[PDB]
Design a protein around this ligand. Structure first.
Ligand SMILES: [Zn+2]
Length: 202
């Protein structure tokens, strides 16, 4: 397991060693992504050696126990922690109320790291580390498998390549930008400021 794709393995082996880790116990580790693709971008990782290397699509289909445990952490145990993190990344003026509708949770259909990781992130996609269409698309299309996706609605592996070829479009308003990733980025910034302006008075 010496591929760079195995680099997450350190967080579940020795979570006590990394400042990036904001919660762990015997079962899971909540860690900040080192290349955040939104203002807040966290990963929830199982520490189970027999689950960490299972593909997320096989997890969704055949490991509901784990799915339910992860959800219980996100929506229960760690909810307050995640909202506080969001306030640190966005604005302290934001309520859990407003943040709840500004966060998404799910797996990549074709992860790039080998250890199972659930993405927990704000919707903005305003971040320096979002650098190409593939990044953006991987979070705003069916390639992002929302944790509440029914098994019957899981994406087909074969058809996954075609998503990354399509014009860029804003997730919030649907405006398209062709392949002008740079124009998309400027617009995402505009969308975030708008959401933030509306939301801080609430
Ligand atoms: Zn828009």
């Amino acid at each position: 397991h010496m591929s760079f794709r195995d680099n997450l393995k350190v967080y579940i082996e020795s979570p006590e060693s990394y400042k990036n880790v904001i919660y762990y116990d015997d079962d899971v580790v909540l860690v900040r992504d080192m290349f955040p693709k939104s203002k807040m971008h966290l990963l929830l990782m199982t520490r189970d050696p027999h689950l960490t290397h299972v593909h997320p699509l096989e997890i969704m289909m055949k490991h509901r126990s784990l799915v339910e445990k992860l959800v219980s952490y996100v929506q229960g145990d760690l909810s307050g922690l995640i909202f506080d993190e969001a306030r640190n990344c966005l604005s302290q003026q934001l309520t859990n109320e407003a943040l709840c509708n500004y966060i998404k949770v799910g797996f990549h259909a074709g992860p790039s790291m080998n250890n199972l990781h659930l993405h927990i992130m704000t919707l903005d996609h305003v971040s320096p580390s979002l650098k190409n269409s593939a990044h953006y698309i991987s979070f705003t299309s069916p390639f992002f498998v929302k944790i509440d996706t029914p098994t019957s609605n899981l994406p087909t592996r074969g058809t996954l390549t075609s998503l990354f070829q399509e014009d860029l479009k804003c997730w919030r308003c649907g405006e398209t930008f062709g392949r002008h990733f740079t124009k998309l980025k400027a617009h995402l910034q505009e969308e975030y400021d708008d959401w933030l302006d509306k939301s801080v008075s609430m």
